[PDB]
Protein backbone atom coordinates (compact mmCIF):
# COMPACT_ATOMS: atom_id res chain seq x y z
CA UNK A 1 0.00 0.00 0.00
CA UNK A 2 2.80 2.52 0.69
CA UNK A 3 4.78 4.22 -2.07
CA UNK A 4 7.98 2.54 -0.76
CA UNK A 5 8.82 0.66 2.43
CA UNK A 6 11.84 -1.61 2.98
CA UNK A 7 11.78 -3.97 5.97
CA UNK A 8 14.60 -6.34 6.93
CA UNK A 9 13.08 -9.40 8.61
CA UNK A 10 16.30 -11.29 9.27
CA UNK A 11 20.09 -11.00 9.03
CA UNK A 12 23.12 -13.26 8.98
CA UNK A 13 26.50 -11.50 8.81
CA UNK A 14 26.18 -8.85 6.09
CA UNK A 15 23.32 -10.76 4.45
CA UNK A 16 19.72 -9.84 4.94
CA UNK A 17 16.28 -10.83 3.86
CA UNK A 18 13.15 -8.76 3.92
CA UNK A 19 10.60 -7.10 1.69
CA UNK A 20 9.96 -3.91 -0.20
CA UNK A 21 6.32 -2.80 -0.27
CA UNK A 22 5.21 -0.64 -3.16
CA UNK A 23 1.82 0.34 -4.52
CA UNK A 24 1.94 -2.34 -7.25
CA UNK A 25 3.19 -5.13 -5.00
CA UNK A 26 5.58 -6.66 -2.48
CA UNK A 27 9.13 -7.55 -3.48
CA UNK A 28 10.87 -10.28 -1.44
CA UNK A 29 14.61 -9.70 -1.02
CA UNK A 30 17.20 -10.82 -1.93
CA UNK A 31 15.44 -10.47 -5.28
CA UNK A 32 16.32 -11.34 -8.85
CA UNK A 33 14.67 -9.25 -11.56
CA UNK A 34 14.19 -10.80 -15.02
CA UNK A 35 15.14 -8.35 -17.80
CA UNK A 36 12.50 -7.09 -20.21
CA UNK A 37 14.40 -5.40 -23.03
CA UNK A 38 11.78 -4.24 -25.59
CA UNK A 39 8.72 -4.43 -23.28
CA UNK A 40 8.93 -8.18 -23.10
CA UNK A 41 10.91 -10.75 -21.13
CA UNK A 42 12.25 -12.76 -24.09
CA UNK A 43 10.05 -15.66 -25.08
CA UNK A 44 7.80 -15.56 -22.01
CA UNK A 45 4.23 -14.27 -21.37
CA UNK A 46 4.10 -12.03 -18.21
CA UNK A 47 1.98 -14.69 -16.47
CA UNK A 48 4.82 -17.16 -17.06
CA UNK A 49 7.35 -14.78 -15.63
CA UNK A 50 5.13 -14.40 -12.53
CA UNK A 51 4.63 -18.17 -12.41
CA UNK A 52 8.41 -18.68 -11.99
CA UNK A 53 8.21 -16.57 -8.85
CA UNK A 54 9.29 -13.13 -10.03
CA UNK A 55 7.98 -10.16 -8.03
CA UNK A 56 9.48 -7.46 -10.25
CA UNK A 57 11.06 -7.19 -13.67
CA UNK A 58 13.49 -4.69 -15.19
CA UNK A 59 12.46 -2.48 -18.12
CA UNK A 60 14.93 -1.19 -20.65
CA UNK A 61 14.87 2.55 -21.07
CA UNK A 62 17.26 2.99 -24.00
CA UNK A 63 15.48 0.42 -26.09
CA UNK A 64 11.99 1.66 -25.32
CA UNK A 65 12.84 5.27 -26.06
CA UNK A 66 13.82 4.18 -29.53
CA UNK A 67 11.05 1.62 -30.14
CA UNK A 68 8.14 2.19 -29.75
CA UNK A 69 9.01 5.42 -27.98
CA UNK A 70 8.41 6.68 -24.45
CA UNK A 71 5.74 9.13 -25.50
CA UNK A 72 3.87 6.45 -27.48
CA UNK A 73 3.88 4.02 -24.55
CA UNK A 74 2.54 6.71 -22.24
CA UNK A 75 -0.19 7.48 -24.77
CA UNK A 76 -1.02 3.77 -24.90
CA UNK A 77 -1.39 3.70 -21.14
CA UNK A 78 2.04 3.03 -19.79
CA UNK A 79 4.40 0.05 -19.86
CA UNK A 80 2.42 -2.13 -17.36
CA UNK A 81 -0.75 -1.95 -19.46
CA UNK A 82 1.23 -2.18 -22.73
CA UNK A 83 3.06 -5.43 -21.91
CA UNK A 84 0.55 -6.98 -19.50
CA UNK A 85 2.67 -6.86 -16.28
CA UNK A 86 0.82 -5.34 -13.30
CA UNK A 87 3.49 -5.71 -10.68
CA UNK A 88 6.39 -3.38 -10.07
CA UNK A 89 8.89 -2.58 -12.83
CA UNK A 90 12.34 -1.05 -12.31
CA UNK A 91 13.62 0.92 -15.31
CA UNK A 92 17.36 1.39 -15.99
CA UNK A 93 18.38 5.02 -16.72
CA UNK A 94 19.51 4.15 -20.26
CA UNK A 95 23.00 5.56 -19.80
CA UNK A 96 24.80 2.25 -19.89
CA UNK A 97 23.21 0.91 -23.09
CA UNK A 98 23.65 4.27 -24.83
CA UNK A 99 27.42 4.00 -24.37
CA UNK A 100 27.33 0.31 -25.43
CA UNK A 101 24.86 0.14 -28.33
CA UNK A 102 24.71 3.68 -29.70
CA UNK A 103 26.68 5.09 -32.61
CA UNK A 104 28.81 8.22 -32.25
CA UNK A 105 28.19 8.97 -28.59
CA UNK A 106 28.82 12.58 -27.46
CA UNK A 107 29.55 13.13 -23.79
CA UNK A 108 29.02 16.54 -22.11
CA UNK A 109 27.99 17.96 -18.73
CA UNK A 110 24.42 18.36 -20.00
CA UNK A 111 24.16 14.69 -20.95
CA UNK A 112 24.89 12.49 -23.96
CA UNK A 113 24.02 12.81 -27.65
CA UNK A 114 23.99 9.63 -29.72
CA UNK A 115 22.74 7.85 -32.83
CA UNK A 116 20.17 5.08 -32.52
CA UNK A 117 21.79 1.82 -33.61
CA UNK A 118 18.98 1.05 -36.02
CA UNK A 119 17.19 3.89 -37.79
CA UNK A 120 18.57 7.40 -37.86
CA UNK A 121 19.16 8.69 -34.36
CA UNK A 122 16.72 9.23 -31.43
CA UNK A 123 19.38 11.54 -30.01
CA UNK A 124 19.49 13.18 -26.58
CA UNK A 125 19.72 11.76 -23.07
CA UNK A 126 20.25 13.87 -19.93
CA UNK A 127 19.42 13.25 -16.26
CA UNK A 128 16.07 15.06 -16.67
CA UNK A 129 15.14 13.49 -19.98
CA UNK A 130 15.95 10.06 -18.50
CA UNK A 131 13.76 10.65 -15.49
CA UNK A 132 11.08 11.96 -17.89
CA UNK A 133 11.10 8.86 -20.05
CA UNK A 134 10.98 6.68 -16.95
CA UNK A 135 7.95 8.65 -15.82
CA UNK A 136 6.31 8.30 -19.21
CA UNK A 137 6.86 4.50 -19.09
CA UNK A 138 5.29 4.50 -15.65
CA UNK A 139 8.04 2.67 -13.79
CA UNK A 140 7.81 2.05 -10.08
CA UNK A 141 11.54 2.20 -9.35
CA UNK A 142 13.33 4.98 -11.27
CA UNK A 143 17.10 4.92 -11.59
CA UNK A 144 19.13 8.16 -11.53
CA UNK A 145 21.02 8.80 -14.81
CA UNK A 146 24.79 8.38 -14.54
CA UNK A 147 28.14 8.09 -16.30
CA UNK A 148 29.53 4.54 -15.94
CA UNK A 149 33.23 4.31 -15.71
CA UNK A 150 34.87 1.72 -18.02
CA UNK A 151 37.27 -0.97 -16.73
CA UNK A 152 40.11 -0.36 -16.32
CA UNK A 153 39.87 3.28 -15.21
CA UNK A 154 42.70 5.48 -13.87
CA UNK A 155 42.07 7.21 -10.52
CA UNK A 156 41.63 10.68 -12.14
CA UNK A 157 39.39 9.23 -14.86
CA UNK A 158 37.26 7.34 -12.31
CA UNK A 159 37.15 10.45 -10.14
CA UNK A 160 35.92 12.85 -12.83
CA UNK A 161 33.30 10.32 -14.02
CA UNK A 162 32.11 9.72 -10.45
CA UNK A 163 32.00 13.50 -9.79
CA UNK A 164 29.87 14.10 -12.89
CA UNK A 165 27.59 11.19 -11.94
CA UNK A 166 27.05 12.69 -8.49
CA UNK A 167 26.12 16.00 -10.11
CA UNK A 168 23.75 14.06 -12.36
CA UNK A 169 22.35 12.24 -9.30
CA UNK A 170 21.31 15.63 -7.80
CA UNK A 171 19.73 16.70 -11.10
CA UNK A 172 17.99 13.30 -11.30
CA UNK A 173 16.64 13.79 -7.77
CA UNK A 174 15.30 17.27 -8.51
CA UNK A 175 13.80 16.19 -11.83
CA UNK A 176 12.05 13.28 -10.03
CA UNK A 177 10.78 15.51 -7.21
CA UNK A 178 9.36 18.21 -9.54
CA UNK A 179 7.01 15.61 -11.02
CA UNK A 180 4.49 15.15 -8.18
CA UNK A 181 2.69 12.11 -9.72
CA UNK A 182 6.06 10.42 -10.03
CA UNK A 183 7.41 11.54 -6.67
CA UNK A 184 4.24 10.28 -4.98
CA UNK A 185 3.99 6.84 -6.53
CA UNK A 186 7.49 5.88 -7.58
CA UNK A 187 10.84 5.34 -5.88
CA UNK A 188 14.23 6.71 -6.89
CA UNK A 189 17.49 4.81 -6.57
CA UNK A 190 20.91 6.50 -6.62
CA UNK A 191 23.94 4.75 -8.16
CA UNK A 192 27.33 4.65 -6.44
CA UNK A 193 30.33 4.95 -8.78
CA UNK A 194 34.05 5.12 -8.15
CA UNK A 195 35.42 2.14 -10.03
CA UNK A 196 37.57 -0.07 -7.74
CA UNK A 197 38.87 2.81 -5.58
CA UNK A 198 37.39 2.94 -2.09
CA UNK A 199 38.13 6.60 -1.50
CA UNK A 200 36.10 7.36 -4.65
CA UNK A 201 33.39 4.88 -3.67
CA UNK A 202 33.30 6.51 -0.22
CA UNK A 203 32.94 9.98 -1.74
CA UNK A 204 30.18 8.71 -4.02
CA UNK A 205 28.38 7.03 -1.11
CA UNK A 206 28.48 10.23 0.99
CA UNK A 207 27.23 12.47 -1.83
CA UNK A 208 24.45 9.97 -2.49
CA UNK A 209 23.46 9.84 1.16
CA UNK A 210 23.54 13.62 1.33
CA UNK A 211 21.07 13.89 -1.54
CA UNK A 212 19.00 10.98 -0.28
CA UNK A 213 17.47 8.09 -2.23
CA UNK A 214 15.04 5.24 -1.65
CA UNK A 215 17.66 2.69 -2.49
CA UNK A 216 21.26 2.56 -3.54
CA UNK A 217 22.74 0.67 -6.45
CA UNK A 218 26.34 -0.32 -6.77
CA UNK A 219 27.35 0.64 -10.26
CA UNK A 220 30.46 0.10 -12.31
CA UNK A 221 30.89 -3.58 -11.49
CA UNK A 222 30.54 -6.59 -13.77
CA UNK A 223 32.41 -4.60 -16.43
CA UNK A 224 35.46 -6.90 -16.79
CA UNK A 225 37.14 -6.78 -13.35
CA UNK A 226 36.42 -10.42 -12.53
CA UNK A 227 34.64 -11.97 -9.53
CA UNK A 228 37.61 -11.53 -7.19
CA UNK A 229 37.83 -7.75 -7.75
CA UNK A 230 34.05 -7.48 -7.81
CA UNK A 231 33.82 -9.18 -4.45
CA UNK A 232 36.74 -7.11 -3.06
CA UNK A 233 34.98 -3.90 -4.17
CA UNK A 234 31.70 -5.11 -2.72
CA UNK A 235 33.45 -5.79 0.64
CA UNK A 236 34.21 -2.13 1.32
CA UNK A 237 31.58 -0.46 -0.89
CA UNK A 238 28.36 -1.99 0.49
CA UNK A 239 29.01 -0.97 4.11
CA UNK A 240 29.25 2.65 2.79
CA UNK A 241 25.62 2.64 1.73
CA UNK A 242 22.74 3.22 4.16
CA UNK A 243 21.98 -0.06 5.98
CA UNK A 244 18.22 0.66 6.09
CA UNK A 245 17.81 0.99 2.31
CA UNK A 246 18.01 -1.72 -0.37
CA UNK A 247 21.41 -2.33 -2.08
CA UNK A 248 21.13 -3.11 -5.75
CA UNK A 249 23.92 -4.74 -7.74
CA UNK A 250 23.27 -3.94 -11.37
CA UNK A 251 23.94 -6.47 -14.12
CA UNK A 252 25.18 -9.22 -11.84
CA UNK A 253 23.79 -12.60 -12.34
CA UNK A 254 25.90 -15.75 -12.49
CA UNK A 255 24.50 -17.98 -9.67
CA UNK A 256 27.80 -17.92 -7.82
CA UNK A 257 28.07 -14.10 -8.21
CA UNK A 258 24.65 -13.63 -6.62
CA UNK A 259 25.43 -15.87 -3.68
CA UNK A 260 28.70 -14.07 -2.97
CA UNK A 261 27.09 -10.66 -3.48
CA UNK A 262 24.30 -11.48 -0.96
CA UNK A 263 26.99 -12.53 1.56
CA UNK A 264 28.28 -8.99 1.05
CA UNK A 265 24.99 -7.17 1.68
CA UNK A 266 23.28 -7.04 -1.73
CA UNK A 267 19.46 -7.17 -1.86
CA UNK A 268 18.65 -6.86 -5.59
CA UNK A 269 20.01 -8.26 -8.89
CA UNK A 270 19.25 -8.19 -12.60
CA UNK A 271 20.97 -9.92 -15.58
CA UNK A 272 20.20 -11.07 -19.09
CA UNK A 273 22.06 -14.37 -18.51
CA UNK A 274 19.10 -16.66 -17.72
CA UNK A 275 17.04 -15.54 -20.76
CA UNK A 276 20.09 -15.13 -23.06
CA UNK A 277 21.72 -18.47 -22.21
CA UNK A 278 18.27 -20.07 -22.57
CA UNK A 279 18.12 -19.11 -26.24
CA UNK A 280 21.69 -20.34 -26.62
CA UNK A 281 21.07 -23.77 -25.18
CA UNK A 282 22.65 -23.40 -21.76
CA UNK A 283 20.45 -24.60 -18.84
CA UNK A 284 21.28 -23.93 -15.19
CA UNK A 285 21.15 -26.82 -12.75
CA UNK A 286 22.14 -27.35 -9.13
CA UNK A 287 25.15 -29.23 -10.45
CA UNK A 288 26.24 -26.38 -12.70
CA UNK A 289 25.18 -25.36 -16.23
CA UNK A 290 24.74 -27.88 -19.03
CA UNK A 291 24.57 -27.23 -22.74
CA UNK A 292 21.49 -29.03 -23.84
CA UNK A 293 22.76 -29.21 -27.46
CA UNK A 294 25.39 -31.76 -26.47
CA UNK A 295 24.90 -35.23 -27.95
CA UNK A 296 24.81 -36.89 -24.57
CA UNK A 297 21.34 -35.40 -23.98
CA UNK A 298 19.81 -36.85 -27.14
CA UNK A 299 18.05 -39.67 -25.33
CA UNK A 300 18.15 -38.40 -21.79
CA UNK A 301 14.63 -38.72 -20.39
CA UNK A 302 15.41 -36.80 -17.17
CA UNK A 303 14.26 -33.17 -16.78
CA UNK A 304 16.64 -30.26 -17.20
CA UNK A 305 17.14 -30.45 -13.43
CA UNK A 306 15.99 -33.20 -11.06
CA UNK A 307 15.05 -30.92 -8.17
CA UNK A 308 13.64 -28.02 -10.09
CA UNK A 309 9.89 -27.55 -9.63
CA UNK A 310 9.29 -25.48 -12.79
CA UNK A 311 6.58 -26.58 -15.27
CA UNK A 312 9.21 -27.39 -17.87
CA UNK A 313 10.94 -29.97 -15.68
CA UNK A 314 7.64 -31.37 -14.63
CA UNK A 315 6.56 -31.98 -18.21
CA UNK A 316 9.44 -32.27 -20.70
CA UNK A 317 12.69 -34.21 -20.98
CA UNK A 318 16.21 -33.08 -21.82
CA UNK A 319 15.90 -35.22 -24.98
CA UNK A 320 12.99 -33.22 -26.31
CA UNK A 321 14.47 -29.86 -25.42
CA UNK A 322 17.76 -30.96 -26.93
CA UNK A 323 15.85 -31.69 -30.15
CA UNK A 324 13.95 -28.36 -30.12
CA UNK A 325 17.08 -26.27 -29.61
CA UNK A 326 19.04 -28.16 -32.29
CA UNK A 327 16.11 -27.76 -34.70
CA UNK A 328 15.96 -24.03 -33.92
CA UNK A 329 12.35 -24.33 -32.71
CA UNK A 330 10.81 -21.41 -30.84
CA UNK A 331 9.43 -23.77 -28.17
CA UNK A 332 13.04 -24.60 -27.38
CA UNK A 333 13.81 -20.97 -26.41
CA UNK A 334 10.51 -20.71 -24.53
CA UNK A 335 11.11 -23.86 -22.52
CA UNK A 336 14.77 -23.15 -21.78
CA UNK A 337 14.11 -19.54 -20.70
CA UNK A 338 11.20 -20.53 -18.42
CA UNK A 339 13.37 -23.14 -16.71
CA UNK A 340 16.33 -20.75 -16.28
CA UNK A 341 14.19 -17.97 -14.80
CA UNK A 342 12.51 -20.54 -12.59
CA UNK A 343 15.94 -21.75 -11.52
CA UNK A 344 17.04 -18.23 -10.60
CA UNK A 345 13.87 -17.53 -8.61
CA UNK A 346 14.30 -20.85 -6.70
CA UNK A 347 17.92 -19.90 -5.90
CA UNK A 348 16.66 -16.57 -4.45
CA UNK A 349 14.00 -18.39 -2.40
CA UNK A 350 16.68 -20.79 -1.02
CA UNK A 351 18.83 -17.75 -0.20
CA UNK A 352 15.96 -15.90 1.56
CA UNK A 353 14.93 -19.04 3.52
CA UNK A 354 18.43 -19.91 4.62
CA UNK A 355 19.02 -16.30 5.85
CA UNK A 356 15.72 -16.33 7.82
CA UNK A 357 16.83 -19.64 9.33
CA UNK A 358 20.34 -18.54 10.14
CA UNK A 359 21.95 -21.14 7.89
CA UNK A 360 22.92 -19.06 4.83
CA UNK A 361 26.66 -19.49 5.33
CA UNK A 362 26.16 -23.30 5.15
CA UNK A 363 23.86 -22.95 2.17
CA UNK A 364 26.44 -20.87 0.25
CA UNK A 365 29.11 -23.40 1.05
CA UNK A 366 26.96 -26.37 0.02
CA UNK A 367 25.78 -24.54 -3.07
CA UNK A 368 29.33 -23.87 -4.34
CA UNK A 369 30.50 -27.39 -3.52
CA UNK A 370 27.81 -28.99 -5.67
CA UNK A 371 27.55 -26.30 -8.39
CA UNK A 372 31.23 -26.52 -9.22
Catalytic residues: 92, 270
- Residue with Cβ nearer Zn ion (57 or 310): 310
- Residue with Cβ nearer Zn ion (246 or 278): 278
Determine, following the binding rule CB under 5 A, whether residue 252 of this chain makes contact with Zn ion.
no
- Residue with Cβ nearer Zn ion (59 or 274): 274
With CB under 5 A as the contact rule, which of the stretches 116-124, 212-220, 242-250, 313-321 interacts with Zn ion?
Answer: 313-321
175, 261, 310, 336: which one contacts Zn ion (CB under 5 A)? 310
Determine, following the binding rule CB under 5 A, whether residue 66 of this chain makes contact with Zn ion.
no
SS (H, E, C) the chain: CCCCEEEEEEEECCEEEEEEEECCEEEEECEEECEECCCCCCCCCHHHHHHCCCCCEEECHHHHHHCCCHHHHHHHCCHHHHHCCCCCEEECCCHHHHHHHCEEEEECCCCEEEECCCCCCCCEECHHHHHHHHHHHCCCEEECCCCCCCCCCCHHHHHHHHHHHHHHHHHHHHHHHHCHHHHHHCEEEEEECCCCCHHHHHHHHHHHHHHCCCEEEECCCCCCCHHHHHHHHHHHHHHHCCCCCCEEECCCCCHHHHHHHHHCCCCEEECCHHHHHHHHCEECCCCCCEECCCHHHCCCCCCCCCCCCCHHHHHCCHHHHHHHHHHCCHHHHHHHHHHHHHHHHHHHHHHHHHHHCCCHHHHHHHHHHHHC
- Residue with Cβ nearer Zn ion (157 or 302): 302
CB of 304 to Zn ion, least distance (A): 5
Q: For residues 318-357, which are near Zn ion according to CB under 5 A?
A: 339
Binding footprint of Zn ion, residue count (CB under 5 A)? 5
CB of 51 to Zn ion, least distance (A): 12
CB of 208 to Zn ion, least distance (A): 39
CB of 47 to Zn ion, least distance (A): 17
CB of 342 to Zn ion, least distance (A): 5
54, 313, 333, 336: which one contacts Zn ion (CB under 5 A)? 313
Determine, following the binding rule CB under 5 A, whether residue 283 of this chain makes contact with Zn ion.
no
With CB under 5 A as the contact rule, which of the stretches 44-52, 141-149, 286-294, 306-314 interacts with Zn ion?
Answer: 306-314
98, 230, 308, 351: which one contacts Zn ion (CB under 5 A)? 308
- Residue with Cβ nearer Zn ion (79 or 308): 308
- In the complex, which residues of this chain contact Zn ion (CB under 5 A)? 308, 310, 312-313, 339
Amino acid sequence: RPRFSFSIAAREGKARTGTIEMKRGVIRTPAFMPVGTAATVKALKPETVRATGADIILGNTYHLMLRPGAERIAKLGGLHSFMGWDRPILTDSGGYQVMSLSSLTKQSEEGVTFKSHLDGSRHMLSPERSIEIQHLLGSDIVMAFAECTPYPATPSRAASSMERSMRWAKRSRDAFDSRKEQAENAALFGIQQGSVFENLRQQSADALAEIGFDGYAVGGLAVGEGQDEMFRVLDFSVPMLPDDKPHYLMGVGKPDDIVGAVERGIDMFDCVLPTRSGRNGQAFTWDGPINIRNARFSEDLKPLDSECHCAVCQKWSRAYIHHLIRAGEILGAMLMTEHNIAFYQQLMQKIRDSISEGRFSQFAQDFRARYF
